[PDB]
Amino acid sequence: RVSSGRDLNCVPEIADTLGAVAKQGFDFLCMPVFHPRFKREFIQEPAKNRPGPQTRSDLLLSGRDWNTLIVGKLSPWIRPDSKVEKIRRNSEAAMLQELNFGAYLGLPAFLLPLNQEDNTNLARVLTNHIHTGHHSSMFWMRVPLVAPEDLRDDIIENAPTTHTEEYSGEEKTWMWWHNFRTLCDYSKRIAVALEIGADLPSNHVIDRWLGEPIKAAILPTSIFLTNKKGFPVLSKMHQRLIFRLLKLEVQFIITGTNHEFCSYLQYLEYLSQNRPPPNAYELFAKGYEDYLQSPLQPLMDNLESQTYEVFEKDPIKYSQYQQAIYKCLLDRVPEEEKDTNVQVLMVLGAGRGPLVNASLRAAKQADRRIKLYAVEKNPNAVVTLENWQFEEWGSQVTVVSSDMREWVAPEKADIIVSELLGSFADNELSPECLDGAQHFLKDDGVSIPGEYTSFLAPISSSKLYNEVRACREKDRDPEAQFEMPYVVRLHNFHQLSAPQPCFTFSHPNRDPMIDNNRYCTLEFPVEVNTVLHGFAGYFETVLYQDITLSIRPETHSPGMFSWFPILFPIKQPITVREGQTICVRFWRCSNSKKVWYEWAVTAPVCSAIHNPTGRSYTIGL
C-alpha cells in the first residue's frame, strides 16, 4: 500500500470524475472547488453582482467523501502578491472565499502554490484564515524542487539561461518555503507538497528538504520513461528519490495527462514492494518515529513492571554484558585456581534480575566460581528478585533492598556490574551512583562498564522544532519545553555534521578530587546551507576491553533498541550558511540534590544559555 491521489484541473462532472479516479486505483482527488477559469469581482460593478451559484453544490458528494477523498485547490488566477492593487484585493477576497468553502466542505487538505519568491500577502491571508475558528485541516504548499525560471528551455536568443554554478541559487525554492512558513509562524497545519521534475537538481538541493514537513510528492506523468514491455518506469536517480520519500511515508500525487494510470500506481507499488524490509530495530521503533518522550529517571522514580519487561526484550544488551563478565572472570582467575577462587560479583541496580542471570551464564561459560549480590533500590523490583531468589537462584545470590550509595556491604567486590546508562550515557546519573558504590570495590576490582562517552551532532528538523514548541504547558515558563532533553526516535531530520564526543566518565574513579561537573566546547563544520533546530545526543560505553555498546549511528550495536537518541532543543532556530562552523557549549552541572545540563550555541550566532540553574530540567539525586 502506497497512498496516491490524482491531480486534475478539469472536472466536468464531479461524481463521474471521482469514480473514474477510484477505478484507476487512486485514494483521493485534487481538484478545483470553483472552476479554475471563473474569475470573480468583489469591488467593482456590474461584475460584482454576477448572479449565482458561484460554484457546484456541497450536496453532489457525501460528507464522508468531501472529508476523505477530496483535496481542494486554489484557483490559478488568485495572486495575492500581484503588483496591481485591484488584482491583489480581488485575490485576497477570492482566496478567503475558496478557503472558507473548503472549511465548509470539511476537506482534509487544500493545495496552495509557492511559484515565485514573494508570497508575503498569500501568507498573511492564510495566517488570518488559520486564526479564524479551530480546525485541524492541512494546507499543502505546492513548491517545485526546481523553480520554473531555472527549468525553461534555452531558446530565448536575447535572454540566455545562466550557465554558471549558483550553489545558493539552485536552492532558491527552499528559501521560498522557509520564508512562507516563517511568516506563518510554523503553523502545524502548513506542510509541503514537493513537485518533482524531469531533471532532478544537484544532491544538495534535494538535501535542503531533509527535516521539512513533506506530506506529498507530486510526480508529473512526463517524468516516467517507458520500458521495453510498454509499462511506465522511472530513472535510477528518480527511483532513489522515491525510496527516500517512501521512508517519510508521503502521499504520491500523479499530475499531467496520460502519455492506463493504474499502471503508474502499480509501478509505485512495485517500488514499495522492492526495498529493504524493516529490521529488528525498525520493527520495535514502528510508531515511535519523531515521538517526543521525557527521559526516564530510574534513580528518582521507581520504574513500572512493563518498563523492565521492555528493557528485557533487548537480546544484544545482555549477551554483550555476559561476554564482558565472561572475559573478566577468565582474566582475573587463572585455570589452576578455577575451583578454589570464588569471585564476589555485585549487580548494582539489578532491576528484575536480567544482569544477575547474565552473570550466572557468564560464570558457567567461563567455568569459574562466583558469589552474587543483587542490589536494587526499587522495592517493587525487589519483590521480583526475592521471589526469583527463592524459586531459582538460592544462596548463590543474596538480594539487597538498598541504594548503592547507602548500602554497607558484608565484603568487598571483585567485579561491580551495572546498567545505569541513559541515551546521553550519564543522564540517569551513573557517575554519581557508581562513585557512591566505589568504596566497596576491592583495590584491584573492575567496574562493568569501565567507561562511557556521550556524543552530540547538530540537527535540522522543522518537524521536531514544531513538536517541541507544541509542548508548552500551563503553570510553567512559556519556553521551558525548549530547555529540556527528549528521548526521541529521530526520523524527519538532517544531521548537519558528524557526531563528536561530549563527556566521558571512567569507573572506578581513581582521583583525589572527584568532580562530575563538565564543560565542553564543540566545533561542527557544516558543508551545506541550513537551519539548526537542536542537537542529537548518543553514547558509547566500554563494558570490558573490546566488549562495547553503542547508539552512535556510525558504530550502532546491531539490533539494539534499548536506547533511542536524545534531543537537546534550541528556543530559536539558527540560520547556518555553507562553510560556517556551528560552535556549541555544553555544561554538566550539579549540587548535592540535583544534576542537570546547560547548553548554548556561540557560532555562527549566539543563543541564550538553555536551562540556567536547572530551572526547566533537573535529574534528581
Binding site: 477559469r37 460554484t55 525560471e149 536568443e157
Partner: protein, 295 residues
C-alpha cells in the same frame, strides 16, 4: 447553451461561430454553435448547428471555412469540422498533449498549422492534417496567456505570459524566441497591414502599439485588457475589451472613438462583420451577444 460565452468569430460568408462554457453549477462542460442568422444568437432554437464538448471552451478559431480548432479545459486541442450541409459539428481529433488547461489557440498564416499555449507553461506547434505536435517549447516560466500567429509569416507568432515576457517567435532560428518590466501582458494583436507592428494589452488596462524592428501607449480600461481585435477597414480601428465589462474602439493613435457598457459581466470576445464593416459583435459572461453600430 451555457451562460459563459467565451468566443465569437464571423467567417467570410458572415456566419457567427460561438464558443461557450458553464463555469459554475453542477456540470462544467462547453459547446460550439454556428449561427447563419447572427441576430438570432444566443437563442438555441434559432441556430444552424451546435454540439456539446466534453469540457469548457477556453478559446477557439476558424480553420478555413469548415474547421473549428478548440483550446479545452481538459488539456486537449480539438478539431471539429462542419457537415457537408453545415447542420452538424463533428469531431476530427481530440489530442491531449498539454498537462493543464489549454488557454489559447491560433492558426498559422498557411492555415495548415496551429500554435497552442497552456497553464502547463508550454507552447506547441501543431500539424493540423497529421493531428500531431511538431514542436514543443518551454520558453516561459509561468502560464501562457495569449498566442497570436503572424497574419502573413507562417513561421512567426507572438506569445505572452505571467512571467512578464512578450516573446517574438521565428521557428527558423535555433533559439526561436526573443523578448520585447511593466505590468503583465494579457492580450496580443498583429496589425493587419504592417507586418512588423502589433498591439498588446496589459493587466492594468493599458493598450500599447509596438514595432518589432524598433512607443505609443494609452490607459483604455480600468481592469485587465482581455482582447484586442482590429477592424476589417482600409485604415483599421482597434476593438479593445476588458474585465471592466466595457468595449472601446480606438483609432490608429489609440484615441477613443466608441465605448459600450452594454455588457453586465466580463466582455470575452469581439468580432467585426465582413458584410457591414461598421458592425462589431461582442459576447460576455452575461450570456449576451451585442451588435454595435461603430462610427
Amino acid at each position: 447553451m451555457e451562460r459563459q460565452l467565451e468566443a465569437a468569430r464571423y467567417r467570410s460568408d458572415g456566419a457567427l461561430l460561438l464558443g461557450a462554457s458553464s463555469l459554475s453549477g453542477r456540470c462544467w462542460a462547453g459547446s460550439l454553435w454556428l449561427f447563419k442568422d447572427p441576430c438570432a444568437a444566443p437563442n438555441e432554437g434559432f441556430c444552424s448547428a451546435g454540439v456539446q464538448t466534453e469540457a469548457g471552451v477556453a478559446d477557439l478559431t476558424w480553420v478555413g471555412e469548415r474547421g473549428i480548432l478548440v483550446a479545452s479545459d481538459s488539456g486537449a486541442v480539438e478539431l471539429w469540422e462542419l457537415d457537408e450541409n453545415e447542420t452538424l459539428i463533428v469531431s476530427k481529433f481530440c489530442k491531449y498533449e498539454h498537462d493543464d488547461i489549454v488557454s489559447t489557440v491560433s492558426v498559422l498564416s498557411s492555415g495548415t498549422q496551429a500554435v497552442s499555449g497552456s497553464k502547463d507553461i508550454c507552447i506547441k506547434v501543431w500539424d493540423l492534417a497529421q493531428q500531431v505536435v511538431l514542436s514543443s517549447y518551454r520558453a516561459h516560466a509561468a502560464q501562457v496567456t495569449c498566442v497570436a500567429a503572424s497574419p502573413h509569416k507562417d513561421s512567426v507568432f507572438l506569445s505572452c505570459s505571467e512571467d512578464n515576457r512578450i516573446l517574438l517567435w521565428d521557428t527558423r532560428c535555433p533559439k526561436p524566441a526573443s523578448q520585447i518590466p511593466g505590468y503583465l501582458p494579457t492580450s496580443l494583436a498583429w496589425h493587419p497591414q504592417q507586418s512588423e507592428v502589433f498591439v498588446f494589452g496589459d493587466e492594468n488596462g493599458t493598450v500599447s502599439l509596438v514595432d518589432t524592428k524598433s512607443v505609443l501607449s494609452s490607459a483604455v480600461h480600468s481592469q485587465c485588457v482581455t482582447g484586442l481585435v482590429f477592424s476589417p477597414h482600409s485604415v483599421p480601428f482597434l476593438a479593445s475589451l476588458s474585465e471592466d465589462c466595457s468595449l472601446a474602439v480606438l483609432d490608429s493613435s489609440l484615441s477613443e472613438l466608441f465605448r459600450s457598457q452594454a455588457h453586465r459581466d466580463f466582455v470575452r470576445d469581439a468580432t467585426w462583420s465582413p458584410l457591414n464593416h461598421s458592425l462589431l459583435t461582442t459576447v460576455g459572461w452575461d450570456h449576451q451577444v451585442v451588435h454595435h453600430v461603430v462610427p
